[model samples]
Target chain A: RTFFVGGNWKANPKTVEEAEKLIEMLNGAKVEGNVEVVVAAPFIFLPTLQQKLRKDWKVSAENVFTKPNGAFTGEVTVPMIKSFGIEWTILGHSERRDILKEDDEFLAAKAKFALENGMKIIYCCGEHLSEREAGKASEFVSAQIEKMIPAIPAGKWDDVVIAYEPIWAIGTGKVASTQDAQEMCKVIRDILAAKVGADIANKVRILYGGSVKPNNCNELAACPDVDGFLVGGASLEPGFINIVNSNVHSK
Target chain B: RTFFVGGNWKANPKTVEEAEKLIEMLNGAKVEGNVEVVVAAPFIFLPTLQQKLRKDWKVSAENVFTKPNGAFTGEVTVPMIKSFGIEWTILGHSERRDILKEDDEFLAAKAKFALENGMKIIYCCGEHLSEREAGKASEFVSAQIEKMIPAIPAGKWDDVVIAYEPIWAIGTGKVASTQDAQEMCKVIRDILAAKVGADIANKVRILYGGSVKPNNCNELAACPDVDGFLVGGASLEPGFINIVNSNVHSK
Candidate 1:
């Protein structure tokens, strides 16, 4: 089994020099020998980081658009990303929902576009605090999965990493308990199973993201339902290497 | 005076290998010894390109938001671009105006934000066929410039490049005649003079964009008022090098 951890360096870091320095640090650090590490950054830094990153590391774009090309101004198309030698992209990030007003339909189209163009997707799904409080978190997340499943070919399930990033927990220091994360992750996989079949669903990896730090990565990774983590703040520090090896020392 | 030419690659090319080939082509070619060559590509390629690009060649983000940092989701922000050491941003492009529905107010805010974050502005303004036919080309172009002038710092006009691209002429194969381009460019400079004062205005570089290519580049560059070109379709080809050298061989 391959352990995967992705860093959504969403518009962070202030300069190419800084990015280079960060890459240098990652290059020298000791990550788990068995895991696959991917860092997703804004477009400006993709190429530089991609080249400078350690040989084992992969890169992902923060998000992509459905259209192949033309007049979708300000939105990066999946084809454009695949051409850049980038293999992964994060679609339906909650920030994309709350900040860019991207709807489920928009994300579904983007997922189809990405898959058609041979790009892997870290498809993020989660409900806001209000939705969870309203006791509709599962319903909301399931619907998001439903929209995506139709677009995803059954054979391509392994290419999609479902990141369950609860909106309320993201960057709020409100880490969900291990059971909370596992429950949602299992529910996400179950939804995929119902839509794509049991074998494909079990093979699909589910990650947890939301205020993920070194302090909590072990417990999060230890969860049976949580295959890996999509880290944020902790990925920026030297501690990222530790997060990658969290499973190694724990076992 | 240093001449500046920008290639808005838009959404062209499809993989890292192709993007690397583009960089190889850029690296192998001999650009005009003194001119500044910049390419504005979608976010996915920015990071990698920044790493591989030659010292004289620069990169710009195709578009960014007015806010420096927050939750704009898939949209990259000015501070985000600046932090990545991307010094240039193309704003108010006709693509953004017509296709994306970005109005003058929105563009002005973006320009202001880009300026505040230590990034230079390539403020694009152009008139459509209807406006040009109505003999209100200058009037419309003047209005676009008028909105951004107040938002930018008075003396910082030197950090801005005003691109006068006629909407109907862009990529339509209807390259503007020297006379057609000169008249609008001169008026744009004059408008800048009125808004930011004559001293800074005359020193500011005014670029002509719209189906600009190697074949017509000499005649267009010969026009005293035309300082440079913001190329589109022709930019993706090797002939872009020819367009860059057009000013030299003609002289």
Candidate 2:
């Protein structure tokens, strides 16, 4: 399977000028290996990303509403994003789940709507601090994945990419150990293989999504089950290139 | 008061093409009176509105996050909107309060942040079905207003516009009666007068926001306290011109 890297700029950079400068930096980066790269930005800055980012790398919305349109105020819908020629979205980010009160059902619905509407999704699932501390991380993460499984249409599995974002490690400067990352990814792949068959599981790209920085990217990339990363804060910095290039280290 | 009228295109017109056409329709409109016209669209469409809408008419965001910018995914912030030169936002709309679970505290925070950051606002407040039925509409809306009053910084009332959108009436096709609309606007103004002093009360524009349409806009516009409207569905239709022109009938 090809490596996949996504830069989720979860609501950063205060101005269009700042976003433009970031795009300039991204456009000038030297990517080293074969990887499918997608950059996600705040909805307000999406047009800038869509219009200015290098065409080879796809642009994505940090989130998308379930409906195509109508009456859900303060939401960006799939059709609206697709209308800009943007084709990817990140659903179930920990920030949204924790801060915005989004539930598994809501994330499931978003995944279903996004995939059914022809958009690819990085569906996020993971365990919180309590779950990890209680040694039930797998159970918690598995439940999240189980909720999302039924939401993907049969033929839409190809458009789905699973991201394991350990909530305890996200934005907390506490990176998951390399072994933990590998274990979780393997657990998810095993769940998919058992439930949906090995062909689909083997083809699915499983990404590790908590505090992935350039310093750790190459090591994480080298893990067998860790196909790539869904990078966060590092995405907005110069190091995102190194994370993207870490694909060269992936065997 | 220059009779402020805001067309809240609340999550409509599913496509960019549709949004551009709506802007074209709005651009061709002939204003019959002096009014401060502002059009609010979804965050994704604000750039388009800012660039395409007539210069005389300002652009607004349907909502904005309390922070200028940060890790609140799926949220659009004040600085991001202001970056595009958009100046207004509608907060505490019934849809956001009911559907998105935004509380008065959250709305107040958003209002404070938006106003402090130099953006105007149409702050919505209203009673739901039970409150209205129990004849406690005044009490309910008063509490809503009271919560918001403290959030406004000193001397920032000039940029504040209150909108009364009875929850039972919004999108229900059962608009508040002309007398009810007038009564609520006066109730809000009277509250402002009592709590904040008459000078601020008299200067603030209070608008009627529930189910406003071309057919009924003229009468509602004529009400003493109904300075203008925060229109919803009609804002996306040609009838919005009539709602904007209704300001000629205000005096």
Candidate 3:
């Protein structure tokens, strides 16, 4: 399947028409064979985009709060997502974690809730530059992985894709070296293996995100540990199509 | 023209299918000639719904922050509303006032921003239960209106539609008496006349909201001070069409 790729539109692209145009462009673009394509649009944009999406292209919401339903004003609930017919949700993005002060336990609860409600989750985990520079990258990623294991059973690992987006690299245009991404991804695999066994670990796709563009995608994709790309800024441009076909054009 | 009625769908309908059903029921409705109909779907659904809507039917947004642009997390700006061609924005609603703790200045700034962006403002002002009990309903609404006058230009008074929704009556089935509604709405008009002008005051539309439904709507709408309604719970039902025609149809 070439492991699929997803774009976290994350409230970018201001207008509704612009958002539709982006989806149309993706639907028309030719990519590597059998690779799945999806976008996690803002909550408001979800229903409109979901209805217009092609069969092959799936859509997810940026985030869904864990609460069932109530007066938790300004929060979107998982049941609402179900009612809205949205099938996937992104949990624990770096921006959400760092900016919104969401801890691992909070994210795990959200992930468990999504799973319980028949929804897939793109569980994001990453360390900041300081954490990496402090030689605690492995520990940081491991801690992020440990929280979810308690709630999510091993059999359901395939439904969850782990995106390792170095906080410093996101939107900063500083691409992580291929070796660095591969090493961290391997660390993630090792942690998963210890938690859920090698069978599930091997099948779980690990994506290297943060400034992933066409120029460097070939190198990142060639890494044995790198299964796919969780692209950011460049994903909005024409270069995103090239990144999707990276493996096909690589020598 | 009778009067404009709107439902602040406020992040309520999460999917387009649900919205389509709401719209379909609305389209199938045999509405009275005297009323203007509009529903404020969340930002994402507005564009698509606007396209499918009948010429007389309009769309609005529940809320918009003061700024036209810049990074404010998880918020839609006034300019963004304008870009979508959504002409009406419900500002200073009780939800934003009480739950969100938005102050008078913030409401003033938001109303100013909406006005500058070429959007009509459905400005809501109301007194809490405690304030009403203290016999300060007129004082409270007047203060909110007076604070906003500095930001609103003189000639643009017609661009605003004031909604007098007593906080105590909202969501509670206890409807305010026609006399109480008349007194408060007249006070609001008097304040508007003082701040803006008698011409704008006489010409402008003022709505009486809070637990308005088909059964009680006729007498309430009969009050000369009670211009129309900013409906809530009952607005979601098929009977909302009846509430719209309340003035003419005594039955």
Candidate 4:
């Protein structure tokens, strides 16, 4: 499988001018090997990113509403995002789960709606610190993926990329051990193989997301099941290019 | 109070192409009376609306996050909106309260954050069908406003416009009687006079929003204290100009 790198610019730079400059910087980055790269930004910044970012790299919405369009005020719908020619969205991120109170059911419904509406998705799942500390990380994360599996419509597994972001490590600078990242990702792939088919499981990209930076990207990239990364803070910096270059380290 | 009419596109116009058409249509509208007009759309479409929409008419965000910028994924912040030269945002709409589970405390934080950061706000307050049927509409609506009042920093009332949208009447094609609209607006004003100050109450534009359209806008506008409207479905139609022109009927 080709390596995948997703940059989640979770509400940064604070202006279109700043965003454009960042886009210019990204457009100049040289990738060392084959990889699928998608950058997610705030909805308001999507148009500029889509218009200015290099054609090889795709644009993604951090989130999208369940419905196509209606009176769900303050929401951007899948149709709206797709209309801009953007085809990808990230759902169930830890920030939304913890801060905005997004539950598994709500997120599953969003995944169903977004997929049914013809958009690809980066579905995020993770175990909180308590669950991880309790030695129930596999159990907890399995439950999240279990809830999400039923939401994907038939024949849509190819469009689904599961991102495993350990809530405790996210943005905390406490990088998960490469062994831990591989263990969690393998657990996820095995779950998919057991529940959905091995063909589907093998094709699905399971990403490890938790403070992934240039220093660790290549090491993590070398892991068998750690197909790629869902990069955080470093995605906005120049070092992001180095992380993207880590695609060369993957088998 | 100077009359104010806010066109809440409320997650409509599925594509940016359609939004640009709507902006072109609105730009041709002629205003006969003094009114502050602000049009809001999905966050992704804001840049186009801000750039192409008429300068006489301003743009607004349907909602804004409480922070400037951060690790909060799937959220747009105040600084991001203001950075685009947009200065207004709508807060506490019932769709967000009921569908998105936004409570008064959260809405209050947003209002305070938006105001302290120099953005004007259209703060929505109203009662549900149960509250209205129980004849506790005024009490219920007042509680919402009471929560919002302290959120407004001292002396920022001038930057605020209060919109009263009867939850049952909103987008239900059930227009509140003009007397009903007037009585509720007055109740809100009296609440402000009692709790805050008459000076602030008298100066703030109190808008009635519930299926307001061209046909009934004139009658609703003529009601005392009915300073203007927060138009819903009609805002996307050509008749929105007729509603904007209804400012002529307002005192």
Compute the TM-score of each model's chain A versus the native chain A and list the values.
Answer: 0.94, 0.97, 0.93, 0.97
Error of 4 at B74 (Å): 1.1
The better candidate by TM-score, 3 or 4, is 4
Off by over 4 Å in 1: A1-3, A24-36, A65-86, A169-179, A222-224, A245-251, B1-3, B15-37, B41-61, B64-86, B97-106, B128-140, B169-180, B222-224, B248-251
Report the C-alpha lDDT of model 1 over B24-132, residue by residue, as the tens digit.
8888888664677788877776766777888778888888887754444356777667655779888988887875577899889888888877788788999988787
Scoring model 1 with DockQ, what do you get?
0.37
Whole-model lDDT, model 4: 0.92
Error of 2 at A34 (Å): 0.5
Please report the TM-score between candidate 3 and the true structure. Answer: 0.76
Each candidate structure's TM-score, on Cα atoms with residue i matched to residue i, is 0.81, 0.98, 0.76, 0.98
The order by descending lDDT is 4, 2, 1, 3
Please compute DockQ, using alpha carbons, for every candidate against the native two-chain complex. Answer: 0.37, 0.82, 0.18, 0.86
lDDT of each: 0.78, 0.90, 0.74, 0.92
Q: Count clashes in each candidate, considering only residues at least 3 apart in sequence or on different chains.
A: 16, 0, 0, 0
Where is the poorest 10-residue window by lDDT in model 1 chain B?
A: B66-75
Worst 10 residues of 1 chain A by lDDT: A242-251
lDDT of 1: 0.78
The residue-level lDDT of candidate 3 at A75 comes to: 56
Model 2 lDDT tens row, B1-251: 88989998887778889999999999999999899999989888889989999999999888989898878776788888888999999998888898889999999999999999999999998888888888999999999999999999997999999999878775555657899999999999999999999999999999998878888999999999999999888999999999999998887
lDDT of 4 by residue, A70-175 (tens): 9988999998999999999999999899999999989999999999989999999998777887899999999999999999999899899999998867546565
